[PDB]
Amino acid sequence: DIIIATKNGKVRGMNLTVFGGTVTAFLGIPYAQPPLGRLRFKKPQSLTKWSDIWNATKYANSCCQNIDQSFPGFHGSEMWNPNTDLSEDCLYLNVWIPAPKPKNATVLIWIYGGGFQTGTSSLHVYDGKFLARVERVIVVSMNYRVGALGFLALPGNPEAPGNMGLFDQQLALQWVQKNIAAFGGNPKSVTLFGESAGAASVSLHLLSPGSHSLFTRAILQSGSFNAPWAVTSLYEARNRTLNLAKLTGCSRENETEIIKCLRNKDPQEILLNEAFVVPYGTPLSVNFGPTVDGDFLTDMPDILLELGQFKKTQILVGVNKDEGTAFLVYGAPGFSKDNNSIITRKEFQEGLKIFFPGVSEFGKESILFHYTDWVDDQRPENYREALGDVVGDYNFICPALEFTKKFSEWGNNAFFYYFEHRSSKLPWPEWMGVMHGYEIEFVFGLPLERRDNYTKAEEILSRSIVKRWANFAKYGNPNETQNNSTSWPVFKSTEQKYLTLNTESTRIMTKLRAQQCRFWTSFFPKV
Numbered sequence: 001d002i003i004i005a006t007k008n009g010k011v012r013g014m015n016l017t018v019f020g021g022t023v024t025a026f027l028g029i030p031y032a033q034p035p036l037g038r039l040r041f042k043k044p045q046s047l048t049k050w051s052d053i054w055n056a057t058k059y060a061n062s063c064c065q066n067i068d069q070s071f072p073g074f075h076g077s078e079m080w081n082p083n084t085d086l087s088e089d090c091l092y093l094n095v096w097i098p099a100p101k102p103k104n105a106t107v108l109i110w111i112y113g114g115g116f117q118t119g120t121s122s123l124h125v126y127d128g129k130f131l132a133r134v135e136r137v138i139v140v141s142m143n144y145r146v147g148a149l150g151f152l153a154l155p156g157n158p159e160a161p162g163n164m165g166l167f168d169q170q171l172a173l174q175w176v177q178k179n180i181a182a183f184g185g186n187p188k189s190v191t192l193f194g195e196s197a198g199a200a201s202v203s204l205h206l207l208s209p210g211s212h213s214l215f216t217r218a219i220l221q222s223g224s225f226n227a228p229w230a231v232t233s234l235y236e237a238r239n240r241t242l243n244l245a246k247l248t249g250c251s252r253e254n255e256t257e258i259i260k261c262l263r264n265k266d267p268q269e270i271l272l273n274e275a276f277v278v279p280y281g282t283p284l285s286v287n288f289g290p291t292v293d294g295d296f297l298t299d300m301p302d303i304l305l306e307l308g309q310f311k312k313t314q315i316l317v318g319v320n321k322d323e324g325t326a327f328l329v330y331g332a333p334g335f336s337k338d339n340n341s342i343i344t345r346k347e348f349q350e351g352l353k354i355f356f357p358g359v360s361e362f363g364k365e366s367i368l369f370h371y372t373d374w375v376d377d378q379r380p381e382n383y384r385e386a387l388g389d390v391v392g393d394y395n396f397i398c399p400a401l402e403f404t405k406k407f408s409e410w411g412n413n414a415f416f417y418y419f420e421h422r423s424s425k426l427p428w429p430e431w432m433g434v435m436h437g438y439e440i441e442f443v444f445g446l447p448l449e450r451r452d453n454y455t456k457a458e459e460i461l462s463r464s465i466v467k468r469w470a471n472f473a474k475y476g477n478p479n480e481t482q483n484n485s486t487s488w489p490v491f492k493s494t495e496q497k498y499l500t501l502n503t504e505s506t507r508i509m510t511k512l513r514a515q516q517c518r519f520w521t522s523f524f525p526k527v
């Protein structure tokens with residue numbers, strides 16, 4: 001019988017068969033009192049103790065969230081939809097441990113993305129058993145509150161303070177510190193990693209003092225806090241909380257009365273009004289996300305970075321080649337997943353209007369001008385690729401590069417990667433390229449499963465990324481082998497070397513898309 005004694009009581013797990021060996025799995029361990037009733041919108045409350053044995057043998061409930069239903073039956077979009085029931089009772093975590101039991105394993109903790117509005121740790125692409133089997137690390141992931149139930153903010157008010165979903169994550173990290181030794185993990189060797197809003201979350205734990213003693217190293221995939229979507233100003237957060245109150249008939253004079261009113265509403269009455277709390281709305285809108293709450297974040301994150309007030313440790317950071325394309329088929333004119341989506345200069349200008357609602361007419365011309373110096377005048381698909389790159393550079397790539405510069409300047413080793421391989425099983429059309437979120441299955445080792453129809457090249461690539469990721473956690477260096485491997489060099493603010501990741505050739509290169517990013521860093525803020 002697979003039983004571990006945690007500080008909150010005993011828990012029962014299950015054995016998995018993975019590549020001729022065994023992986024012990026504890027799925028659905030609770031780490032907080034269910035944020036129910038009068039606990040809605042509050043920070044996670046600590047668990048006391050249960051007598052008996054909690055059965056950690058199935059994934060738990062996913063947190064309440066809206067579902068993506070733009071393309072019914074389509075794997076591409078539905079693979080991101082939650083695969084367990086939805087409920088406010090959702091603060092559980094998972095633990096994968098190598099067999100035979102380890103004695104001081106390094107721990108990898110996964111934080112999922114989803115625009116801070118969606119996502120769940122139980123998706124197939126986040127399965128930690130491969131990493132545990134192959135690289136002998138412990139893998140932990142947690143469900144955290146997303147949307148208004150996770151990030152609703154009345155700053156200074158303990159009844160609805162902001163950043164609850166971030167404290168949810170933080171409490172799960174506290175759980176690992178207190179309990180992972182019992183499973184065979186080393187609490188002094190803990191690495192956070194995550195993608196997109198998960199990577200922005202990871203970069204925020206770097207800034208937040210309360211998290212600093214709860215992990216060792218950090219990995220940021222396709223996200224950072226300095227992204228234009230990641231953080232709301234204090235008062236923009238409050239104005240959306242008030243707008244949501246108006247939409248549900250919870251407008252009051254007293255703040256606490258507003259919250260006590262919102263506490264009576266059905267979760268679904270809240271979910272259906274989240275879209276409307278912001279005038280504009282682009283496919284990258286974050287209705288309810290992190291804000292400067294005065295607690296988890298004691299200042300605007302760019303300030304804390306600039307002043308060098310963050311955790312001093314090693315980071316691994318990177319981005320995909322086509323971060324932007326995914327967002328174009330959810331709004332922009334002329335774009336479909338069922339077309340080659342070849343568009344005109346006019347449609348391009350409409351596309352820009354969708355993504356930059358508040359920008360002047362001159363400003364949109366600027367963007368257009370910078371991204372139309374064609375190598376070949378036609379090339380019919382020039383404009384389609386231009387829009388994809390505009391959205392990708394501004395929202396993901398250039399911020400990740402800028403965060404890494406600034407972070408590296410305070411004396412810790414950083415490593416930057418450029419992921420260029422398109423998955424052979426990618427359900428989306430080819431014109432969308434190496435999409436946002438489609439390096440994840442390579443990081444979790446899914447191509448190592450030969451029963452799954454991946455290419456041999458893809459198993460090699462995945463096995464390589466897995467080795468480097470796990471090695472970074474253990475040694476602060478993403479080496480593969482000492483011999484017969486490309487040296488991954490540190491990212492320094494002067495030379496700015498990065499490593500590209502694909503099946504053809506992993507090369508060392510410099511100043512990734514500097515000509516593009518120069519626009520966003522040095523001209524766009526002045527429009």
Ligand SMILES: COCCN(C[C@@H]1CCCN(C2Cc3ccccc3C2)C1)C(=O)c1ccc2ccccc2c1
Pocket residue numbers: 066067068069080113114115116118196197229283284285286326327330436437438
């Ligand atoms: C790697 O994740 C892949 C899926 N995506 C990306 C797709 C992109 C198109 C819109 N999709 C929305 C549409 C919709 C409507 C109702 C419910 C769910 C959804 C999904 C999301 C995310 O999770 C995601 C979502 C939002 C983000 C915001 C800022 C930054 C990154 C973000 C990433």
Ligand SMILES: *[C@@H]1O[C@H](CO)[C@@H](O[C@@H]2O[C@H](CO)[C@@H](O)[C@H](O)[C@H]2NC(C)=O)[C@H](O)[C@H]1NC(C)=O
Pocket residue numbers: 103104186188189
């Ligand atoms: C697991 O590994 C850690 C090292 O990361 C061991 O660490 C403590 O490590 C610190 C250094 O960070 C030393 O200063 C302490 O003296 C160590 N304490 C003890 C009791 O050894 C830790 O001991 C290891 N645990 C095992 C092997 O069970």
Ligand SMILES: *[C@@H]1O[C@H](CO)[C@@H](O[C@@H]2O[C@H](CO)[C@@H](O)[C@H](O)[C@H]2NC(C)=O)[C@H](O)[C@H]1NC(C)=O
Pocket residue numbers: 471475477479480481482
């Ligand atoms: C990757 O490089 C690191 C260097 O940082 C190697 O780390 C040492 O690892 C061994 C265990 O194999 C330890 O006994 C040493 O104490 C480590 N030294 C330092 C300075 O970290 C690591 O072995 C390399 N791994 C591979 C597969 O090449």
Ligand SMILES: *[C@@H]1O[C@H](CO)[C@@H](O[C@@H]2O[C@H](CO)[C@@H](O)[C@H](O)[C@H]2NC(C)=O)[C@H](O)[C@H]1NC(C)=O
Pocket residue numbers: 484485504505
């Ligand atoms: C050294 O390691 C490299 C890994 O990069 C090996 O690489 C390739 O070898 C396979 C043969 O199984 C070819 O199919 C690939 O095209 C090679 N990749 C290239 C050339 O980029 C290599 O075989 C190893 N060599 C030695 C001497 O150990």
Ligand SMILES: *[C@@H]1O[C@H](CO[C@@H]2O[C@@H](C)[C@@H](O)[C@@H](O)[C@@H]2O)[C@@H](O)[C@H](O)[C@H]1NC(C)=O
Pocket residue numbers: 235236239240243244246247276277278279
């Ligand atoms: C705050 O936002 C206000 C927007 O109000 C709107 O009313 C809500 C209920 C929604 O229906 C929304 O779609 C509407 O746009 C602005 O009028 C106001 O100026 C903003 N104030 C600050 C300080 O940001």
Ligand SMILES: *[C@@H]1O[C@H](CO[C@H]2O[C@@H](C)[C@@H](O)[C@@H](O)[C@@H]2O)[C@@H](O)[C@H](O)[C@H]1NC(C)=O
Pocket residue numbers: 001052053054055
């Ligand atoms: C957990 O399941 C218990 C029964 O399932 C198991 O009983 C064990 C003795 C062992 O044989 C396992 O292999 C079985 O799967 C049940 O009695 C408990 O009530 C359950 N716990 C809770 C909290 O409901």
Ligand SMILES: *[C@@H]1O[C@H](CO)[C@@H](O)[C@H](O)[C@H]1NC(C)=O
Pocket residue numbers: 001002015022099
């Ligand atoms: C759990 O795994 C261990 C180690 O492989 C094995 O000895 C034991 O029989 C397993 N228990 C099960 C499958 O209930």
